Amino acid sequence: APLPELLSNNGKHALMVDGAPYIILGSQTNNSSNYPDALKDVWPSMEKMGANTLSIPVAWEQIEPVEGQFDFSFVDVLLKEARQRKVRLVLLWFATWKNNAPHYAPAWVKLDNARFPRVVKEDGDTLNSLSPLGQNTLAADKKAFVELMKYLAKRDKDHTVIMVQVQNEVGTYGAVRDYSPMAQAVFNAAVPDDLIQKLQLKPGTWSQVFGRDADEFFHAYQIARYCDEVTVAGKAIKNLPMYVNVALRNPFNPGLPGQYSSGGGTDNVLHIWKAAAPNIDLIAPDIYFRDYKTVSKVLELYTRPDNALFVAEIGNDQPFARYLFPTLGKGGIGFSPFGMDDTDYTNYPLGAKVYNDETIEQFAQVYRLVNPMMREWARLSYQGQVWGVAEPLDSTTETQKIWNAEATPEEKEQHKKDRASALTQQLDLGLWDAEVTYGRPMFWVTPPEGNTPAAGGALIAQLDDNEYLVTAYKARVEFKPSQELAGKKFMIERVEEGRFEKGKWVMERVWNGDQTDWGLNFTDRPHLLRVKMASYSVQ
Amino acid sequence: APLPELLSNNGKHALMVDGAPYIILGSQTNNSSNYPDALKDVWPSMEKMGANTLSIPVAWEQIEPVEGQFDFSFVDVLLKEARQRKVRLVLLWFATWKNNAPHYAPAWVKLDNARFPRVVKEDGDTLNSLSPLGQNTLAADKKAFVELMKYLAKRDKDHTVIMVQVQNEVGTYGAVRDYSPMAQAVFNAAVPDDLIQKLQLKPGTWSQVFGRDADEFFHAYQIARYCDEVTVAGKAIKNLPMYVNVALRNPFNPGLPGQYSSGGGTDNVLHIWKAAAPNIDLIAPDIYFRDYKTVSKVLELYTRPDNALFVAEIGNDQPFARYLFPTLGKGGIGFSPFGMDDTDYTNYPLGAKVYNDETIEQFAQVYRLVNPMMREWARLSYQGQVWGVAEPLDSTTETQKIWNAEATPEEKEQHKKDRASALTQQLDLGLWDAEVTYGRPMFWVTPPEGNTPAAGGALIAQLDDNEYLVTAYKARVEFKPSQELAGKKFMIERVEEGRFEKGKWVMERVWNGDQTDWGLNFTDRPHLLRVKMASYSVQ
Ligand code: NA
Ligand code: NA
Ligand code: NA
């Protein structure tokens, strides 16, 4: 079977798996589930979720517990159990950095600062974050990563593993960069030529060329180079797609580097990362912001002509499930909720307060919309036109409930109108537009009041000028002409509910009458529709 | 197999069973379950609880219903059923005293006051409490107890019965001592030499040597001698460990002897009991105080270089389960909740209002932490260093809930701070300290607010200078250096979850990342951890 690969063309992207575009409908384990005995607490969640791909760590400490006495016994069991369940894997290389720190590096690495040095603050104190200028550290990480890739080259010829994350949330908290003498010598030197050329900049030292951003851009550059080298060495063994995942700064109100993880692929240093690390396939956001506006901004910033969108981690609380829709609508190649296992941990406040079947079911319900068309959707996303939206108001707060109640009757009616309007989205589909609304009956035209909790969304793919594939969730989708018709009228020509079997459309039933008089109304159950529209003459 | 025995060395203790230290994770029946037909209502509770030892009465009235005519049919059945279930037994000899009174003595004893005399009050009235100076009573009790011990010598060679309680809550309510002419004659006489020598006192009569404490100390001494003689006679037949259990006085606010049970092993007469009864292995508190401060004080007073801690009875309501932790932390040899059977009785207000699976489960959940390491814990407790803590605030009262709500915003914030601080415990583990906190998320650092109801605790054993065995319940445990290091930093080197198999540690998984970033967080599920800490140079 051909290698998985990330294709980029015409500002669009596809993750090719087994020779065709693929969507990762993912689940990711908690951080301590990377052992054979823990897998029994991972698989059942995956099954309940309907996930097709598991993201799970492989730690440097476990594969090289003594230097270089390699142990791949976890990987062996993981591959075999994944294959039995017919799912794919994304392995997460937890090594020099995991959330800025070396906790998953072997004891012989993390306890030997002389050989493998830490970031030194400007005031001389040391942080528990390994410096990207540590040459021994790079060589050692690289060597172990190579051994892992050799294991996959020899033992995973059908590519059960489809992608590898290199490190996990790199960077440093508590300082902007390494200020050690070793780092200071490089910082005081000339900015490397290659970076100067790629950005279109005048030569100089770091402070001269970057000014107020020199410290942060320096750290980003050095980390990016470190990760790029590890990536190249591993890809020389087996050329799987590889990516890095970002501990995000708030895109609207980031604060200072060091408060956020400095040097990772934050939105202000994507240009540094892309210039410095041409061998890393994509830079993936880890999304734990709950609110629609911030999440939407993150999806906008990380979807670029030079960057495929992969939501490598997202919170597992209920409000996060609907972000699958805009993720896919942007041409995203995947989506992977974090902490989908029963190993007795909840990362609340970041995710769900409790982990049970209801937690899983919020994601299972949205994955059920995509699974039955996964390959067809992936192709259309890469080659054609897709759209995707989520319910754009967050669930009403207790503070907002109080303020709501204390309001004048005129103000309450105005608020309802404001909410209805905010809960109405327009999509321009060429000759036709769609209007998506949330939280209303399936009959008549009473205005939308939203779902409680906020949960809805819709996916649309264009099949032809007048024909669309549509599936949605707790929402109404209504079609209309995109431009004035000139003495023509319009209608729905035909709505079919069905499925793809061996790549061919099979009709189950025609929606008509009540089911198409008031838009196309979706609840929590999965329905995949082919909608054909027509303008017609009445002259 | 070798006889069970209580060892005492270097101010520490162990209950040896089958040649190694043992922890009684007990259950005790209600008072009327000591019959073959009642056992079907006892065993299922034991199984649901995960108890390893059953405490159950054997009554003088049932073994010698007619003088001279012994009946061990109950004991026969009990032994056989216990063996089938692979549990051990502690038999409770209910004889001359059961809660101060002779109700479990045969009719031919308790109805013959001439032969077997009662305590006489100073005013000449009689109380239903047998005088410890009644020589016929002592001889008769002793004779029956000897027959019981003969039955065990001949019919329990593998020591299904590991310990015997001699009497049950001895003493007298309603008077301080016996004031009968017979007792008055002894009280007026010289204090016995042996007691004078052992306490380091000047000879004299009771009033002269003890003053204001003479009446109470006299009753304690006489009862202690009576119980010691019974104990010696039984041990001459089979030398099992034997103990007495105490109807406690409130250690902070006891009131007067006679209001509490005068003459039992209350905290003010332990010195009398130890001097008078050298053959009784230990003196065990019966704990029905609900509140942390009082329970903690009782555990402190009963844990002594000359007294192994055994919580021979404790209430079976929810708040009591967490006291297993400090019991074991003090080097306790056992813990036995009272009334764990379904014989249609609740001793509420002393225990739980209702008896059902939930009542049992509160104890099952904490026994599940200890059972998998029972032998390893018992050894470490005897030979090494252990610690144990329980959540130190009791559940918030309705009165405190009202007061909390009516409070000013500044006062509410101060109260939360005060509670957080009270819900934070420090333990000095040598080179490392642990901080235990209760009722907080498993991620980030928001301050502890306590569990509702109060329920948490933690056990720690030292394996080496930098390595500890840890298990806890509804709590967070965080490690730090015990002393400022000098230009060194520190981290967790490794946390392994696992179990002991044939006395050897088997690793199941490594806790890392999220699972160790914010201390070690436990819910209601059992996890046994080996925690290795490291200081490291950054010079
Ligand atoms: Na248009
Ligand atoms: Na210390
Ligand atoms: Na200290």
Residue numbers in the entry:
A (entry chain A), B (entry chain C): 37 to 575
Copied sentences from the primary study:
Given its poor sequence similarity to other GH35 enzymes (vide supra), this two-domain fold exhibits low homology to other currently known protein structures; only one significant structural match to another bacterial GH35 β-galactosidase, from Caulobacter crescentus strain CB15, was found. The (β/α)8 structure of the CjBgl35A N-terminal catalytic domain reveals a centrally positioned cleft running laterally across the open end of the barrel. This topology appears to be consistent with the requirement for binding of extended, branched oligo/polysaccharide substrates such as XyGOs and/or XyG and thus the cleft was anticipated to contain the catalytic active site. Despite the observation of separate protein domains, it seems likely that these together solely constitute a catalytic module, i.e. a distinct biochemical/biological function is not indicated. Structure/sequence homology searching of the C-terminal region in isolation produced no significant results that would indicate similarity to known regulatory or carbohydrate-binding modules (CBMs), despite the observation of a trough-like surface somewhat reminiscent of a substrate recognition cleft. In addition, the observation that the early part of the C-terminal domain is formed from a distortion of the final helix of the barrel domain, and that the initial β-strand of this domain stacks directly against the penultimate barrel helix, strongly suggests a rigid, monolithic structure.
Genome walking in silico revealed the presence of open reading frames encoding a predicted β-galactosidase from glycoside hydrolase (GH) family 35 (CjBgl35A, encoded by locus tag CJA_2707, bgl35A), a predicted TonB-dependent receptor (TBDR, encoded by CJA_2709), and a predicted α-l-fucosidase from glycoside hydrolase family 95 (CjAfc95A, encoded by CJA_2710, afc95A) upstream from the gene encoding the known α-xylosidase CjXyl31A (CJA_2706, xyl31A). The data indicate that CjBgl35A acts strictly as an exo-galactosidase that requires terminal galactosyl moieties on XyGOs. Rather, the specificity of CjBgl35A is similar to plant β-galactosidases with a general ability to remove side-chain galactosyl units from xyloglucan polysaccharides; the GH35 member from A. thaliana, Bgal10 (At5g63810) produces XXLG and XXXG sequentially due to a preference for the underlined side-chain in XLLG (Sampedro et al., 2012 and references therein). The liberated XyGOs are then imported into the periplasm via the TBDR, where the exo-glycosidases CjXyl31A, CjBgl35A, and CjAfc95A work in concert, together with a currently unidentified β-glucosidase(s), to yield monosaccharides for further catabolism.
